[PDB]
């Protein structure tokens, strides 16, 4: 019951975050980034993501 409510809240938060990303503009990548952000810095993570994108290109 309580666990189910927590799962619903997490799903709702993820949907809201995705909408914000689309406006400022995938879901799996956002989930990994959100977990890393919660642990701990933010500027350094952005630089690493930009470098990885350049390497892929």
């Amino acid at each position: 019951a309580a666990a189910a409510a927590n799962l619903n809240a997490v799903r709702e938060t993820m949907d809201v975050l995705l909408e914000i990303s689309r406006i400022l503009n995938d879901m799996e990548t956002l989930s990994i980034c959100v977990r890393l952000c919660e642990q701990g810095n933010p500027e350094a993570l952005s630089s690493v993501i930009k470098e990885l994108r350049k390497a892929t290109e």
């Binding site: 709702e12 938060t13 809201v16 909408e19 914000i20 400022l24």
Partner: peptide, 16 residues
């Protein structure tokens, strides 16, 4: 219009 939507979205994130 997008900026107004962003303000509403930020409030929703705080609520959840």
């Amino acid at each position: 219009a997008d900026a107004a939507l962003f303000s509403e979205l930020h409030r929703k994130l705080h609520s959840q």
